[PDB]
Design a protein around this ligand. Structure first.
Ligand SMILES: COCCOC[C@@H](C)OC[C@@H](C)N
Ligand SMILES: COCCOC[C@H](C)N
Ligand SMILES: COCCOC[C@H](C)N
Ligand SMILES: N=C(N)NCCCCN
Ligand SMILES: [Cl-]
Ligand SMILES: [Cl-]
Ligand SMILES: [Cl-]
Ligand SMILES: [Cl-]
Length: 341
């Protein structure tokens, strides 16, 4: 009996994807989930993960490659590879030279999820939901505390977002930018932040328990759809703010000690099938990286500019770079100060 172990982000597959694969191939899939790049990276660096496939963000994979934790993908076993968007492959190749190790899966942005009615009640009809001012201006966050504020537990993304907002290089290599202005602003915001978490905010937005969050786009659209399906009167939306936002590219990769490689390739080729991955986008509200799949995606998802953004919006997006050891240390120490504030 063939088995296959997969570690993916939570809320990042359709409900029947695995069952359909199992029914087709006769392979038993053990599927587990995470909500943190740091948790995944720690597992990869500490020893065997026990998984045959894992799904880091590409900027984290860039760092992980130098430790040798992945094995290169045999493209001859990935004939549906051609379906992938060549322009996205080129962007991911900045992290994964010649696309040797990573298969792009989904991509989106780190923006603001919010309860439309609650934010307009607190900050008025002209609340600045088009701007990071909504949540990074202390005077606004002090008022939104009234209905609940969450930030991602994602230090590289939060600091890059703050640096961009402050007019710095999002990937600044100046240590004082982290210890000075970025820490200063985050510490002024901290008293108003209910929690730092990268998955509880979905249901809390959907249920009305928080009214604003730093969130990943498709997670927030899921929250919006859950409220609609519940017919609970909660109206959640998502904003890519005017100052720009971070884009991320999540990728499948194969640990170097994977046990069931043939099964892993069967699963990857299944995901390269346009109807399979379009079906996933339909349920998780994320743009997939498969150009052949785009016309098969539901119009509700494909025509949402907060999911498949147009060129003028993509032009304002930035990506993470890997930081050197000094900046990595300074950033991690600053994040510790912020969470316990
Ligand atoms: C795993 O392969 C058999 C398919 O069963 C799926 C469900 C019904 O049972 C396993 C649960 C515990 N995830
Ligand atoms: C467990 O082996 C793979 C076959 O399972 C089919 C499931 C019941 N959908
Ligand atoms: C065609 O989608 C690629 C999206 O890329 C975003 C970059 C930052 N421009
Ligand atoms: N920022 C990232 N690399 N990934 C976020 C994906 C979240 C899917 N629920
Ligand atoms: Cl069994
Ligand atoms: Cl090595
Ligand atoms: Cl008003
Ligand atoms: Cl449709």
């Amino acid at each position: 009996q063939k088995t296959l172990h997969i570690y993916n982000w939570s809320d990042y597959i359709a409900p029947d994807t695995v069952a359909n694969f199992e029914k087709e191939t006769g392979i038993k899939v053990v599927y587990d989930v995470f909500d943190s790049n740091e948790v995944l990276e720690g597992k990869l660096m500490a020893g065997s993960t026990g998984f045959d496939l894992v799904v880091p963000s590409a900027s984290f994979l860039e760092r992980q490659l130098t430790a040798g934790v992945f094995q290169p993908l045999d493209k001859s076993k990935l004939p549906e590879w051609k379906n992938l968007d060549p322009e996205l492959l080129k962007l991911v190749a900045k992290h994964d030279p010649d696309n040797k190790f990573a298969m792009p899966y989904m991509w989106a942005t780190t923006g603001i999820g919010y309860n439309v009615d609650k934010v307009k009640a607190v900050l008025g009809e002209n609340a600045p939901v088009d701007s990071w001012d909504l949540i990074l201006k202390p005077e606004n966050l002090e008022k939104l505390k009234s209905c609940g504020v969450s930030f991602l537990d994602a230090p590289e993304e939060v600091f890059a977002t703050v640096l961009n907002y402050l007019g710095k290089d999002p990937n600044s290599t100046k240590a004082d930018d982290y210890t000075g202005p970025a820490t200063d602003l985050l510490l002024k915001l901290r008293p108003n932040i209910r929690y730092f978490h990268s998955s509880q905010y979905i249901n809390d937005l959907a249920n009305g328990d928080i009214c604003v969050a730093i969130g990943w786009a498709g997670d927030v659209w899921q929250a919006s759809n859950r409220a609609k399906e519940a017919k609970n009167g909660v109206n959640v939306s998502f904003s890519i703010p005017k100052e720009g936002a971070m884009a991320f590219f999540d990728v499948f990769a194969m640990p170097a000690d994977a046990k069931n490689k043939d099964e892993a390739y069967q699963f990857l080729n299944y995901l390269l099938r346009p109807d399979v991955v379009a079906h996933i986008s339909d349920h998780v509200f994320y743009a997939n990286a498969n150009k052949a799949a785009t016309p098969l995606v539901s119009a509700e998802v494909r025509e949402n500019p907060g999911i498949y953004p147009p060129a003028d919006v993509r032009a304002k997006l930035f990506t993470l770079k890997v930081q050197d050891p000094k900046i990595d240390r300074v950033r991690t120490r600053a994040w510790t100060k912020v969470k316990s504030g």
